[PDB]
Design a protein around this nucleic acid. Structure first.
Lengths: 555, 411
DNA sequence: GGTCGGCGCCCGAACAGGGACTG
DNA sequence: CAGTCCCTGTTCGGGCGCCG
């Protein structure tokens, strides 16, 4: 067998494990013809070689139909081999995005034919890559081959090709530094600011530099005229957009159809602004069978109709201009939902997106806004390598009030206030010093770990008192209940003294939303107040009325 | 032509496999240049995907330094090689270094490139350079010499280092030299003038063997932050309640603290703003507790076999308090930082500066880096902390969320 | 079809660790 | 007292989308 022009990548098995000897699936007669036709052809071109009984290994094989063609593709079920093969460190750290592309005078796109079959495999490993071809008769022994290139379906092939490909492009990239070559697997975006005459020359210089190593650049896949089709987009000299997205129009929706719908909606959210999937993902909570039919909710059909109307109109993104600043602007779409757009000139979006992750049982709009800023910051440095300037619907004073007093560290990069309702604000402020002339409530609450019963109430400096029997409760739920009672029964200004660390912590974090209805009720009473002062005193120390009300709510 | 020191991982562990995090443009361009140059000087060489190990990498600029510096997050590698640089080739810790009037730090990382690394150990020094928008897949390298930021490098180079320092240690015996990571700590009681002079004597003494920095410390002027009680002449119900809670909380440190009398002043269900006269028995329990806060804690001493642990609290208005301990409530050192870079405008820059100052103090006093309990969300820290980092080492950390309870460390 | 790798999101279930009370 | 439990936050296992 001849030697491939490309260097081979040494591969080992994991120590102490032998190759796979697994048998073969029974195959339909229509796929047996497609395999023996492909096996005898790849054997002619030096890509698979026969093996005798000295090879004790075996692995299954099958063949699926290629999309929009009569040719078949050969795949190997290497699930047992992949287990015992060494681990690789994948080099594809992410997916390129068109928003990171700079406007280039000339652009060329090409795609190499049978990329995995132009790159060799390590000699030693080939012996492991053994499989049997079943004949049309179940009695025929069958044809046993062993691979010599990268088998499609093996876990090392993508990691090996990308590193081998980059090593071949380095000499051309070293001689042609101003040539931008976006290299994602087998696809080469080649752009340059050279004149269109000197550009086609460099195109052929590389198509020959690639040809020297066994990499064919067919003129069928060659692309010289805009619009180019690259990574599932459409690149025009001034604008880009995604290739058309097709949502299902089922009359009866299953869980998998929502998954396929939610998936394409998330994919559409990178340029199509304002896509919401809150009410559609609520269909996926607590469900067990994909194959289970689910009826759409009124809030879900409305969200789908709005998303369909957005996909009707055409949208397009622009390219990255390094000379002008990067800008990102956020809106509060819905409760727990956020959207953003990244641009450099107004309305000329580089890309859009959404953030909706609910972190914690207790949160507010300021926290969620801070979490979205970070999600955008990371995504930005990926695509462009810088942090965009931020237009945020929060008052500069509102934010200054928050981060200066909050006990965690928190920060937002260079930003500016944009007056786009709904504005993010703090719905209440806890006073720092006790209010002069305000009734003082000493609250407490306890329960029994067995009876799940408890009391909760208060005693005031004016003699006011209440104790309320509670059922199905915990020590935490009672201490929160005691604070809810003091707020209900106090004026616009109130001083409240509790001994629960658990409660004070939830509240000093000034939350505006919560998964617990009791917390949500506490919030609503806090907003109705003009001044509120919380304070903590240790329990069981005989403190004020906190020992006279620890004894009334004891049982 | 130098023989390599054979190294091995601690038994029963695999190398680091940590993903690389996204990097800015000004850092990637800085790494590509340094890596292409280091490759040309044979210090590194490209590798492939057969190596299953990886370690994150980024770049920094030290304080008042125009030049970029390559930094590798070998924390996961160092945890998996701990037996080597502690059992076989450890470095003693001069307990007098913390007592010098001035201590200067010198980046000596360039000297490690002179020594080759063990061939079988180069597999674990693997890292990856990312590309903006993932234009190209990851450009991978591995180290051919002693890497900067690895805890095995100053152990292998120690024998070579001691021989370089002997002509200077003999001329100047009263000077104390300690080596930690890529840094060299030199302390002397000399006046600030002739101190900086002897530094340049050693800088030229190091240039003639194949090696520059300048950061000055004053460990004798390091103060501790005690727990203090206010000196009010008129006390209210609320003042006495905050006083008891803080005194109740501090009782876990000083067991002699008692709050009974004060509690007795909080018998009635009184309004918070109501002025309360201090009884005669109360004014004495307040003065004795103030004196117990003057005394040192009983039974607090440093254990070399225990990990250092640090806690940091945000006090607002540019104030940050910290405590360093090995066993809870047995604080080896406490303190407070104020008016650092980024005050009143950037919490993360302040927290980053504080971790550095604290870690530097931990190296001078015990020769260990503490594990940090950081008062910040995990996602907020992992986003911004590299932009304000200005040191060649990286401590370990974790993320907490303890709401304030009763301002124990700052008035 | 029931092959691989990369990246994103959504969910629940499992892990984990700190605070208060009791055995 | 260690041992629960009440609570909350993180990690990870499993679905689709996209790219080749």
């Amino acid at each position: 067998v001849p030697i491939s022009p490309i260097e081979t990548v040494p591969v080992k098995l994991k120590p102490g494990m032998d190759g796979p000897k697994v048998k073969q699936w029974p195959l339909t007669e229509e796929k047996i013809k497609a395999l023996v036709e492909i096996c005898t052809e790849m054997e002619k071109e030096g890509k698979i070689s026969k093996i005798g009984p000295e090879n004790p290994y075996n692995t299954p094989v099958f063949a699926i139909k290629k999309k929009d063609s009569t040719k078949w593709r050969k795949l190997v079920d290497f699930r047992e081999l992949n287990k015992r093969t060494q681990d690789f460190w994948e080099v594809q750290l992410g997916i390129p995005h068109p928003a990171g592309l700079k406007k280039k005078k000339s652009v060329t796109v090409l795609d190499v034919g049978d990329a995995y079959f132009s790159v060799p495999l390590d000699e030693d490993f080939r012996k492991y890559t053994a499989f049997t071809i079943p004949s049309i008769n179940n009695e025929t022994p069958g044809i046993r081959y062993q691979y010599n290139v990268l088998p499609q379906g093996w876990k090392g092939s993508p990691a090996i090709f990308q590193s081998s490909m980059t090593k071949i492009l380095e000499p051309f990239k070293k001689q042609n530094p101003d040539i931008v070559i976006y290299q994602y697997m087998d696809d080469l975006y080649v752009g340059s600011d050279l004149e269109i005459g000197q550009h086609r020359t460099k195109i052929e210089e590389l198509r020959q530099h690639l040809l020297r190593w066994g990499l064919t650049t067919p003129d069928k896949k060659h692309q010289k005229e805009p619009p180019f089709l690259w990574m599932g987009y459409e690149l025009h000299p001034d604008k880009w957009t995604v290739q058309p997205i097709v949502l299902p129009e089922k009359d009866s929706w299953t869980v998998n159809d929502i998954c396929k719908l939610v998936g394409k909606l998330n994919w559409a959210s990178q340029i199509y602004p304002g896509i919401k999937v809150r009410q559609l993902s609520k269909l996926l909570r607590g469900t067990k069978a994909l194959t289970e039919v689910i009826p759409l909710t009124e809030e879900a059909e409305l969200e789908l109709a709005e998303n369909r109307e957005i996909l009707k109109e055409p949208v397009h993104g622009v390219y990255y201009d390094p000379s002008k600043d990067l800008i990102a602007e956020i809106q509060k779409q819905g409760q727990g939902q956020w959207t953003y757009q990244i641009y450099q000139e107004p309305f000329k979006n580089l890309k859009t997106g959404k953030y909706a992750r609910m972190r914690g049982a207790h949160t507010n709009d300021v926290k969620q806004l801070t979490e979205a800023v970070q999600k955008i910051t990371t995504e930005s440095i990926v695509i462009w390598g810088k942090t965009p300037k931020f237009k945020l619907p929060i008052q500069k004073e509102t934010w200054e009030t928050w981060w200066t007093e909050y006990w965690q560290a928190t920060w937002i990069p260079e930003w500016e206030f944009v007056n786009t309702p709904p504005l993010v604000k703090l719905w209440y402020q806890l006073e720092k010093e006790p209010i002069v002339g305000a009734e003082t409530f000493y609250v407490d609450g306890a329960a029994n770990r067995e009876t799940k019963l408890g009391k909760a109430g208060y005693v005031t400096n004016k003699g006011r008192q209440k104790v309320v029997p509670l059922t199905n409760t915990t020590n935490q739920k009672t201490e929160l209940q005691a604070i809810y009672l003091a707020l209900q029964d106090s004026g616009l200004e109130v001083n409240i003294v509790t001994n629960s660390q658990y409660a004070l912590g939830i509240i000093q974090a000034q939350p505006d939303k919560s998964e617990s209805e009791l917390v949500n009720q506490i919030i609503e009473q806090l907003i109705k107040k003009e001044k509120v002062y919380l304070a903590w005193v240790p329990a069981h120390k005989g403190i004020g009325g906190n020992e006279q009300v620890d004894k009334l709510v004891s049982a | 032509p130098i023989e390599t020191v054979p190294v091995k991982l601690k038994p029963g562990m695999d190398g680091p496999k940590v993903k690389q995090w996204p990097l800015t443009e000004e850092k990637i361009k800085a790494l590509v240049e340094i890596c292409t140059e280091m490759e040309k000087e044979g210090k590194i060489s490209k590798i492939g995907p057969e190596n299953p190990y990886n370690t994150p990498v980024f770049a920094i600029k030290k304080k008042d330094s125009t030049k970029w510096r390559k930094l590798v997050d070998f924390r996961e590698l160092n945890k998996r090689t701990q037996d080597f640089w502690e059992v076989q080739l450890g470095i003693p810790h001069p307990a007098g270094l913390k007592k010098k009037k001035s201590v200067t730090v010198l980046d000596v990382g360039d000297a490690y490139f002179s020594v080759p690394l063990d061939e079988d150990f180069r597999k674990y020094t693997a890292f990856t350079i990312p590309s903006i928008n993932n234009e190209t897949p990851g450009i991978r390298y591995q180290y051919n010499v002693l890497p900067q930021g690895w805890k095995g490098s100053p152990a292998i180079f120690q024998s070579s280092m001691t021989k370089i320092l002997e002509p200077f240690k003999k001329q100047n015996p009263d000077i104390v030299i300690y080596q930690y990571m890529d840094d060299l700590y030199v302390g002397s009681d000399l006046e600030i003038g002739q101190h900086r002079t002897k530094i340049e004597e050693l800088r030229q003494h190091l240039l003639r063997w194949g090696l520059w920095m300048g950061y000055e410390l004053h460990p004798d002027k390091w103060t501790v932050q005690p727990i203090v009680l206010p000196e009010k002449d008129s006390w209210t119900v609320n003042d006495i309640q905050k006083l008891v809670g803080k005194l109740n909380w501090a009782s876990q440190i000083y067991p002699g603290i008692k709050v009974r009398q004060l509690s007795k002043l909080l018998r009635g269900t009184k309004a918070l703003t109501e002025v309360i006269p201090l009884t005669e028995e109360a004014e004495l329990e307040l003065a004795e507790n103030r004196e117990i806060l003057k005394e040192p804690v009983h039974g607090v001493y440093y254990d070399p076999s225990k990990d250092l642990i640090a806690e940091i609290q945000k006090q607002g208005q540019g104030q940050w308090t910290y405590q360093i301990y090995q066993e809870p409530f047995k604080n080896l050192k406490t303190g407070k930082y104020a008016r650092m870079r980024g005050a009143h405008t950037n919490d993360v820059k302040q927290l980053t500066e504080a971790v550095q100052k604290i870690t530097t103090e931990s190296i001078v006093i015990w020769g260990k880096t503490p594990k940090f309990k950081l008062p910040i969300q995990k996602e907020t820290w992992e986003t911004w902390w590299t932009e304000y980092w200005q040191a060649t080492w990286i401590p370990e950390w974790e993320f907490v969320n303890t709401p304030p309870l009763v301002k124990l460390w700052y008035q």
